[PDB]
Every structure is written in C-alpha cells, then in structure tokens.
C-alpha cells in the first residue's frame with residue numbers, strides 16, 4: 001500500500017528534445033542492507049502490453065536504449081529520455097517492488113511533430129450492408145497532425161451530423177501522426193433519396209477544407 | 220523465446236466467476252514469481268497479486284483490492300498460471316496480463332515479460348456477433364481500403380489484413396459504443412499498382428460470439 005504518484009500527467013515533446021518525469025513514493029523504497037531502491041519503470045506504447053525499462057531505480061534492463069535513464073533514492077525518482085524518438089510515444093509507469101507491487105498512474109508522453117494534412121478516402125455502403133436495409137458511408141482521414149480536426153458530412157450540400165460516429169487512433173509510433181474514421185449511418189431508403197455524399201475535413205493545415213465525395217447515381 | 224499467452228477472458232455477468240489462464244514457455248517456470256496485472260480501458264496498471272517460486276514454496280500474495288475475491292495458482296507441470304475471479308463487477312472489466320516476476324532477489328525483482336493480455340467485460344448485455352462489411356472505393360498510385368465491423372458486443376474484435384502480413388499502412392480504430400453495440404473500422408493503404416491485381420482481405424475475429432470472418436475487398 002505504498003502510494004505512487006507520477007508527474008506530469010502528460011506532456012508533449014518534439015523528437016530530439018530531452019524529457020524528464022517524476023515518480024514519488026509515500027514510503028522509502030530504500031533497503032539499507034542492499035543499498036538499493038526497489039523502483040521499476042515501464043513503457044506501454046499505444047495498443048501494446050507494458051515493457052520493462054529500469055529496475056532498482058536506475059538499472060537499465062537488457063536491450064533498453066541508453067537514452068533512457070533512471071535516478072533517485074528513497075521517495076523521489078526520475079526517468080530521463082535524452083533525445084526523444086517518435087518510437088518513445090507511450091505511457092510510462094513507475095512501480096514500487098519494496099513491498100509487493102504498486103504502480104503509479106502513469107505519465108503520458110505525446111510527440112510534438114510538424115503539421116500534416118489528412119489523406120481522405122470515402123466509401124459508399126457495401127452492397128452486403130445495403131442488403132440489410134442499412135447504409136454506412138465511411139470516411140478515413142489518415143496520417144495528419146495535430147489531432148484537432150473538423151469533419152463535416154455534407155449530404156446533398158447540407159451538413160448532416162445525424163447518425164455520425166467518429167474514432168481517432170492513438171499517435172503513430174513511426175511518423176507520430178493521427179488517423180480518424182468518420183462513419184455516417186443511414187437507412188437504405190434514406191440513402192437512396194439523397195445522391196451527393198461529401199466527407200470534408202477542415203484542419204489547421206489549410207483554411208480550404210479537404211474534401212472527398214461520390215454521387216450515388218454514378219456508382 | 221520467452222512466451223506468455225493469456226486465455227479465458229470474455230463477457231461475464233455481474234456476480235459471475237471466471238478463470239483466466241496464462242500458458243508460458245521459453246523459460247524455467249518454477250523458478251519465477253508470476254504476477255497478475257490489470258488495466259481498465261483508459262486507466263492505469265494495477266498489480267493484483269503474485270505467486271512465488273519453488274524456493275519460496277509457491278506462496279501467494281495479493282493486492283487489497285482483490286484479496287479474498289481472486290485466487291492465484293500455478294500448474295508447474297504445464298507451466299500455466301491461473302487466476303480465479305469471483306463476484307465480478309463493472310470495476311473488474313479490464314485487460315488482464317500475466318507477467319514474469321522475480322527469480323533471484325540479488326538479480327531483481329521486476330516484471331521481465333508480459334503477455335498480450337485477455338479482456339474481461341463484466342456486463343449483463345448479451346453477446347452479439349459482428350457484421351463485416353468490405354469497403355472498396357467507388358485512383359492515384361496508392362489505394363486505401365477498409366473493413367466496417369458493426370456491433371457486435373462485447374469487446375474486442377481482432378482485425379488483420381491478409382493474415383497479419385499487412386501490418387504497415389494499417390490503421391484500426393478504437394471501438395465506439397452505440398446502445399450496447401460496438402462499431403469499429405480498419406483501413407489499409409496499398410499501392411494501386413497492386414490492387415485489385417493482388418487480393419486484400421480483412422480477417423475479423425470476435426472470440427466471444429465465436430465468429431471468424433474473412434472479407435475479400437473486391438472492386439466495383
């Protein structure tokens with residue numbers, strides 16, 4: 001029941017820059033006999049299981065790049081990532097092993113990169129979905145930055161916002177971009193009445209919306 | 220090659236029980252403390268307890284959160300780690316990991332290797348299979364395709380393309396809930412000099428409804 005607190009909650013840093021985060025313990029993790037602190041650091045990249053980086057506060061686990069460094073004693077600990085790489089995108093947890101085990105609540109490391117415009121694709125309802133009387137028009141906005149983007153479904157010129165589901169991916173581990181998918185769901189009889197289906201993103205990389213569309217009657 | 224595979228997760232009603240297992244290999248099982256750790260969606264890691272190694276007599280210890288409610292044990296003949304969970308609540312819904320813990324104090328101490336995890340959803344809602352819909356275009360050296368996986372409950376579904384050989388250029392979007400039914404989509408970008416001359420198929424798996432589906436992305 002040693003309590004572990006981490007700070008900052010999250011932070012954004014550009015590739016190359018140094019990062020430092022903190023781990024604080026409600027009790028000392030120092031064994032006076034072994035003269036070691038029982039603190040471990042873990043890396044959990046997006047959509048992955050955690051990976052060990054450091055144990056004994058500062059011992060670098062095998063295979064771990066030496067740009068990662070742990071320091072500290074007793075109740076105050078620190079993980080440093082000199083020169084951050086895009087691959088370093090992850091949530092970092094500290095953990096005491098002095099008495100059983102207890103994790104902190106993590107420090108999320110986001111990557112500041114250059115602005116990037118989405119690649120937009122649009123997809124009409126599949127014939128097999130149409131068979132069910134339902135209709136989903138799907139749009140992919142891939143590899144863009146930053147995360148804040150404005151996607152509006154223009155049905156026959158007029159915005160919709162009715163029956164829309166959106167979902168963002170975490171930051172990419174390679175290029176540090178985001179992707180998102182917008183799915184507009186109609187009934188089939190709904191889908192036939194209208195013809196023009198436009199997916200458009202207004203992103204901070206342009207005052208001109210990026211837009212893709214098809215006409216149902218041209219399919 | 221050290222390997223940890225979690226099994227036994229799924230949809231389980233509130234108040235229900237469930238036994239997770241964790242097959243291991245690539246190392247000498249009895250020598251290691253094995254730990255269970257969990258992670259609710261969008262939440263931090265929580266150690267639930269461990270079972271020690273042979274030298275320690277395989278004694279067990281727990282976190283206060285699950286102590287007296289969860290039971291850890293190990294089959295040393297098969298190198299399999301177990302976790303019995305009782306009276307599951309919403310707060311128990313999470314991804315459950317097994318991890319290889321300490322061997323020798325003089326060496327430490329930490330969780331060396333983790334499994335992929337197995338997901339538990341404590342819920343009254345009924346398991347429902349997914350419809351998998353192929354997403355083809357209605358034209359520029361690079362074509363994007365997709366799969367719509369429409370709910371479907373509970374999480375997760377697995378999506379791969381061409382059996383996992385298509386991993387780069389694959390974006391899979393977190394599932395969004397819709398009246399007790401999840402929807403997710405996946406997208407792959409391949410050179411258009413390559414499609415549809417070569418096949419692009421998505422492989423969706425929903426272990427809970429026992430569904431496995433292959434959806435070929437055909438033109439038109």
Ligand SMILES: C=CCO[C@]1(C(=O)O)C[C@@H](O[C@]2(C(=O)O)C[C@@H](O[C@]3(C(=O)O)C[C@@H](O)[C@@H](O)[C@@H]([C@H](O)CO)O3)[C@@H](O)[C@@H]([C@H](O)CO)O2)[C@@H](O)[C@@H]([C@H](O)CO)O1
Pocket residue numbers: 031033034038097098099100271275321323324325328
């Ligand atoms: C009362 C302490 C006695 O001896 C120690 C000491 O310096 O405190 C600790 C001894 O620790 C072990 C051992 O056989 O090496 C290992 C301990 O591990 C665990 C545990 O199993 O619960 C898990 C570890 O990650 C860590 O959390 C430790 C704690 O730091 C508490 O020690 O607990 C544990 O299994 C103990 C066991 O309780 C018997 O003491 O044994 C050992 O290092 C001895 C040394 O041989 C003589 O001083 O020092």
